[PDB]
Design a protein around this ligand. Sequence first.
Ligand code: K
Ligand code: K
Ligand code: K
Ligand code: K
Ligand code: K
Ligand code: K
Ligand code: K
Ligand code: K
Ligand code: ZN
Ligand code: ZN
Ligand code: ZN
Ligand code: ZN
Lengths: 370, 376, 370, 376
Amino acid sequence: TRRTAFFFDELCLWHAAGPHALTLPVGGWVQPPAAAGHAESPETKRRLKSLLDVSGLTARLQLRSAPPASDEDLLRVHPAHYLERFKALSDAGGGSLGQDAPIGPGSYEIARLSAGLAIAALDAVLAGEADNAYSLSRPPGHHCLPDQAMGFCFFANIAVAIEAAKARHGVERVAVLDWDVHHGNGTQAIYYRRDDVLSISLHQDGCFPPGYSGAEDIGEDRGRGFNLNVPLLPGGGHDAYMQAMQRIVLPALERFRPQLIVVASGFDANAVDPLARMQLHSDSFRAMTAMVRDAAERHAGGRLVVVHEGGYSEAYVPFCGLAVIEELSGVRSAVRDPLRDFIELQQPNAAFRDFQRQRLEELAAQFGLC
Amino acid sequence: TRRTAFFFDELCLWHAAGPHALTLPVGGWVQPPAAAGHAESPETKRRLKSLLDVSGLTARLQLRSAPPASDEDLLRVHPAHYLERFKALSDAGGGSLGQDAPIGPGSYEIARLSAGLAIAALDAVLAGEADNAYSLSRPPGHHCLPDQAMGFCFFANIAVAIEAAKARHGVERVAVLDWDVHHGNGTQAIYYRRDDVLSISLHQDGCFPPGYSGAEDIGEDRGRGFNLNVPLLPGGGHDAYMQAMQRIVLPALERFRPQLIVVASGFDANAVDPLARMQLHSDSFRAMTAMVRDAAERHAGGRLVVVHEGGYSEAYVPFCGLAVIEELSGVRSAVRDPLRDFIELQQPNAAFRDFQRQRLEELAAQFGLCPAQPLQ
Amino acid sequence: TRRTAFFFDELCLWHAAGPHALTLPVGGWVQPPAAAGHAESPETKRRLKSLLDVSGLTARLQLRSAPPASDEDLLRVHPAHYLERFKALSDAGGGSLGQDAPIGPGSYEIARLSAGLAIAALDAVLAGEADNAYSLSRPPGHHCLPDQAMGFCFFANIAVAIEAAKARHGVERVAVLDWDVHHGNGTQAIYYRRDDVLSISLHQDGCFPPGYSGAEDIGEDRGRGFNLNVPLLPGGGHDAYMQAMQRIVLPALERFRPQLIVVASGFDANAVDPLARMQLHSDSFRAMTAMVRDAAERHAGGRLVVVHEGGYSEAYVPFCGLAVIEELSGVRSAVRDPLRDFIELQQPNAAFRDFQRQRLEELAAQFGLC
Amino acid sequence: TRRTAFFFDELCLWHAAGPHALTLPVGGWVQPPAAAGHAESPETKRRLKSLLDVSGLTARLQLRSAPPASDEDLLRVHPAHYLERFKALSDAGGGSLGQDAPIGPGSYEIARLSAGLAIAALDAVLAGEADNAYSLSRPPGHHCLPDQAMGFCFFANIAVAIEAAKARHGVERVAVLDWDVHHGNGTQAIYYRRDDVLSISLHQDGCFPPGYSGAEDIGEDRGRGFNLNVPLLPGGGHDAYMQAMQRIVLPALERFRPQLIVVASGFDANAVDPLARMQLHSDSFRAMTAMVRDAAERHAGGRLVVVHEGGYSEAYVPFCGLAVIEELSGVRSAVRDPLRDFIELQQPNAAFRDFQRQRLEELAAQFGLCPAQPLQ
Ligand SMILES: [K+]
Ligand SMILES: [K+]
Ligand SMILES: [K+]
Ligand SMILES: [K+]
Ligand SMILES: [K+]
Ligand SMILES: [K+]
Ligand SMILES: [K+]
Ligand SMILES: [K+]
Ligand SMILES: [Zn+2]
Ligand SMILES: [Zn+2]
Ligand SMILES: [Zn+2]
Ligand SMILES: [Zn+2]
């Protein structure tokens, strides 16, 4: 077994937007839901923590919290006026900070804590306190721009954590693998002209931001070649992702030689997620974690941090998150995923798999990875 | 104009299974949800009715209920021992009538009413009481086999309605277009060797029942050529469905000359549904309804019945159902679908569209379907 | 059977405040609920409508909607600046209009419709279109002051309806019986110096507004004697209310000779309500309705309007509301209240009943009604 | 200081009955709730744990779980056929184990764990591992009879824990103070003819079981004088409970000289609970806990165990439970109860307080209770 730190704070589960039906603000033609609320709900993360507890896996992890992100840490990425505007709206009982960026009362303090967990997770792994770590950072981060909240993200959690780590530890090469089903536009933008951070996003082609594919966006100037977008066809599942990992991600990491790998781990590529159209099961997430852990072992002395991002199935995210944490820790709990065999039967047929495989081969060639 | 009957009963919204997380029975490693419950929830149909009300659509429809299905009607399809078993379990507070077929307390009476609405909707249209009809039949029907509940369906609503219509009116040719995103396996099985019902299912390849495609299953013996499965690739959206409609569905209806068209209208092909991976928006459903209404006007004297089946997005199903009912009635409300433009941007790219289009062309050829143009 | 109009609009069920746990705004130490939300929820009224439908009673009523209250109607009670402030907050996605007065997006238009239903219900009965009427006016009205939202009420529904009726029909004597479990402070204040409206409130002593009893507040000057508060001891049930009706309410109505009776019908005196401590069952509400209908028949030519106010038990309000509507219409549905016999067993004992009875006798004497 | 053990297991929050509206089984005229479900919901205990966490209280406690109750432990109270019946129903997806005793899938294992936490909490305190303990035992226990589940209780948690403690430690005198707002009928029945357990219940007169008061039920034969019921008038609040504590509970404990005090701590006497009509606030619970902790310090070497029972306000139970745990541990968090001042203003008036006070004075006399002052 490996020593896995689990960064968690109950307060992160207390962030909540005003009334929404899925992602639609209530009002106009949108009736208030009788129960549900915004897709980015506490239950889509709480149920992961609950399952970690009931499985007993929590007892085999190093459980940690952290202080909230300081102004100094936040200001490496975000302007003081952004902090001010966010705080003011949060103090006024919430509202809209951006397009698809709704906040609630006290969301400002809670978002600082989310960012703080990510900072602390990178710190712990670079300090040798754990071999690897998982940070349950809610609200999520990977769509957030320096001065623009987006896609349910209010601070750029991973970028804040990276800039803090560079300041404190002087790490030179960080890879960020973003397997949240949506494009990691925040991470991409921040590091677009940088060669010290390799940003890779696997995402459903055109999902969010809507209509964005991005294969041709490989970074610029000093960063040219240090950003890779893999826009997978909607409907893809396990094979599409395994092919992307083998043909693009692993070769890209091999060439870059990261000293630390950070995963933007959304689970919204799962087969029952409302916010995308991909077909992953819990063993897909297990396999991706195994592959990136192996890459971390080969290049980064094992130094791997997984940061929770998206995932909107209350029923199924917990099984997917559990699989990741089992793989990080090398511990196998008694949990059996009850949907795995069902999802295996729903996968793309051979003709569709081949179609997607050929596109990935072409993309690997475009990237110079063949 | 057009006179659209809306068969609805509030009691259909009172059916509810025991605790589930989406489709997973609670227990073992599945934690009870704090609110949600089984995916087939009352709210996924109630919000449609609410939106019909606030938009002013309900006021422009012929709002009707019906008596529940009689034992006679149900026994045309289901055995007495099935009825007995269902009733006993329903009287005992519910439970599992099969894999993915959970019921709750009183679900037997409510399922009889759901079937009754479908029977009545077909009756009304064949009787000339309305030009067309929509039946909010919950619980749904299209997966139910004669002696096996399946896929949240407990009676074979559409088949029960058809067999009742044949007994009462003597209709000879009925087409059932099933655009619920899952395979209409109940309808297929019941009519598999029959030429008096053309069953067509558009579905996500391999979704539910899991791993079933079915393109080669075209019916047998007397029914050979009277069943068509169109297994669309996961991830497809508007174009995939329009192409399926134009290349397969419309030619198949033209050849069959239905006297009545029934739609098994699930909305779970919508772009945010948890139970499938397709990318339809409300205008996709509107366009499919326009096409089938036109087919009904040409062959069947306008006789078209749409029967609610699946659809699991509480937020988005209402907009999709509203679009269908607007198209049936010829009434356009002030409702603007707030996700339409967003979903448009998420559609498959040209390479993926072409790939799916070529498969549909091959499938139309495999079916021996001639690309005729609509005519009277 | 009588001709009963049922004023209802689906849009009234679409009003919804921001996140609350019961009556507590989310934030600080108050965790967002996983489902529930504000106590004044759509479900506490929707379930009444649903049960009316499933029972078939809806088919035996005269179903009506109405246009929203005009500015002219609203401005008889409320200032233009109140309307403006309410609209602005509603257009900004909601917030707090007052103490225990939270609104949501579009609540302004919905509150106008609620008030419009009440206006229309009084109009219909005074016009002879129905013998009596029930108005499902959500959000409720009876705590609202002219320039101060309070207690989940944003317009003074009943007062707006009365002033509209006086302008259109010239009715001279209206009685308002408020059996919502909380004090009808809005109605009381507006008509406190008026003898053309007799305001009676039955309420739990000190419940809401908190600590208010009010027996000594009988109106002033021209209105002296035309306001009656009956502060019932917490814990009382059927007998306490029957005694209040017989010893105070009926004699008060007999003396006043109303030409129209309006009931502010909250159901929050029911035995499982979270927002009060009283023990009514559905036959209590049936009996109160029978008594006030009889009073309306004796004095007002049958002219009775019941306006929905409070009631916070999703499970039990529907049975209580159904009983009222059965009594108004003279139709008895097949519905059997499944909690009635249970609640009958929980009632105050003889010593407690006698204690409360003696207090009501003393209060009847104070009011000059002995 | 003070070392407080907090017996908690996440799995206790996974017990869930089939659909109910508050306490009403869904079916017939009872519509399924859109969210809520049975009043005995996980959220009414989860929000306590969450608040303990965010307030920093959990970090200052000894957080412990325990193994589930063994068959041996359960069979001290319950028959094997009861265990068998419960397990069978739990394995079949749940249902009704009696009137107001609904279970769900896996509830058997979870109820065993709830009982196990109570057993372990008594063990820990008798073993000197902690000064006192709180056990979040869900599902609750105090209504359960040996062969009859009742009032949302499926095993007699406190009685099972006591009989296990007697077997393991040989404790001779245990007092059970039950301030859950409903009558502790299970505890009363089991120990009704026993002098080794003093059972005291404060409850709303006639609430649950419905119409039961019970002041004249003081135990029989060997147990005569070792059961006390205090049926408080509906509508009572802080003063009623303080008066009951001072005039009845403390004198009764003084005479009994318990070696261990167990509290059946329901929070359903809180001022916003749907399942009773009483008016307690968080400081009422704090004050009761201070009084019983002091009694435990004087008689029992500090040995006090609080076992969670009822409490049905999701919003308000957390503040009440937090106050109890603060008092057990001697730790005061930064939490300020946001309803405390409001509830203070709603309290019975002086006439009503005097009326209830006089009844308690009469009841203390009827019980032959001497008003002694606390001493060591
Ligand atoms: K991504
Ligand atoms: K880069
Ligand atoms: K289909
Ligand atoms: K066929
Ligand atoms: K009142
Ligand atoms: K007056
Ligand atoms: K008690
Ligand atoms: K005893
Ligand atoms: Zn995402
Ligand atoms: Zn379906
Ligand atoms: Zn009220
Ligand atoms: Zn209780």
